[model samples]
Target: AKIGLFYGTQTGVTQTIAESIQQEFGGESIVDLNDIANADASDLNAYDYLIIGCPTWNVGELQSDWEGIYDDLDSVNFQGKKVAYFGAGDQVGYSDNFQDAMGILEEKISSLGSQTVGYWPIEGYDFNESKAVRNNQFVGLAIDEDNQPDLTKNRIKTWVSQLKSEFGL
Candidate 1:
């Protein structure tokens, strides 16, 4: 089945992570997210899974682009459809708010009757706790305090594995 790797990225972090995942999971699935905005959700009924990514906003809020599009998903019915969420965030002492974007999308998708594929987790700096642990240590564009990218290849791999398993790929 085809897979739609949709993502809402402000600083391009989520997009980068999405591409990395697509690259890693290549040949195992059909991937595309660039045209989600124009693509019809009904067309996705045949897809094996839907993976979305976004960045957290201030105080556990959803990113602008994500919230805008996600808010309008009510029209499309996704009952029994498989879905997955992922993202990057700056916790900054706010681990609870980390990946807020993903959480918001998850809720919206659930309201539309979509099936959640796996844990919607965050990867990146923890502002609340100055010291942060990074799995990849360094992967993306910038280096965090721990000298690492916001999301690591390791983290992306894990997320990909979960999504793959969810779709029985």
Candidate 2:
């Protein structure tokens, strides 16, 4: 099965996480990661599964490039596509707006007929608020590279495994 992985980054953290996820999913041959800034929404049609990631910008805004592509995504049909999302943020510093972009991504794509998977539990994080949370669960994997950098690898590993099962990979 092919997977289309895309991400938007401000300081490159999201790109790193997206690449790590590529490796976890058996490398670029199976899961190819693309920077949303340089990719077209129609290009995503090549894969059955789509993974989108971005870091939350100041005060919970989506990374600039992601915001730029948001309108184009509305023209892409996601019927029969399975999607997952991830977000990077400093939860300790931005507790009130942690990973908010991830939630926005989830909401946007779901409206285009994509079935979103990989909803993570919100129990362990110390965030006071997040737009990414729905029904007591996170919209996707949330990474805190500033405060919990050491946890990122293991979290990616676990999240990828969960995604494999969800995607029937």
Best by lDDT: 2
For model 2, residues 15-69, the per-residue Cα lDDT tens digits are 9999999999998777887999999878887777999999998898999998988
For candidate 1, write residues 82-141 as lDDT tens digits. 887666765544555545566566677767788776653324443332111234221112
lDDT of 2 at 126: 93
Badly placed stretches (over 4 Å) of model 1 are 27-29, 35-48, 120-151
Candidate 2 residue runs with Cα over 4 Å from true position? none
Error at 117, model 2, angstroms: 0.4
Residue pairs in steric clash, candidate 1? 91-127, 92-126, 92-127, 92-128, 93-127, 93-128
Error of 2 at 31 (Å): 0.3
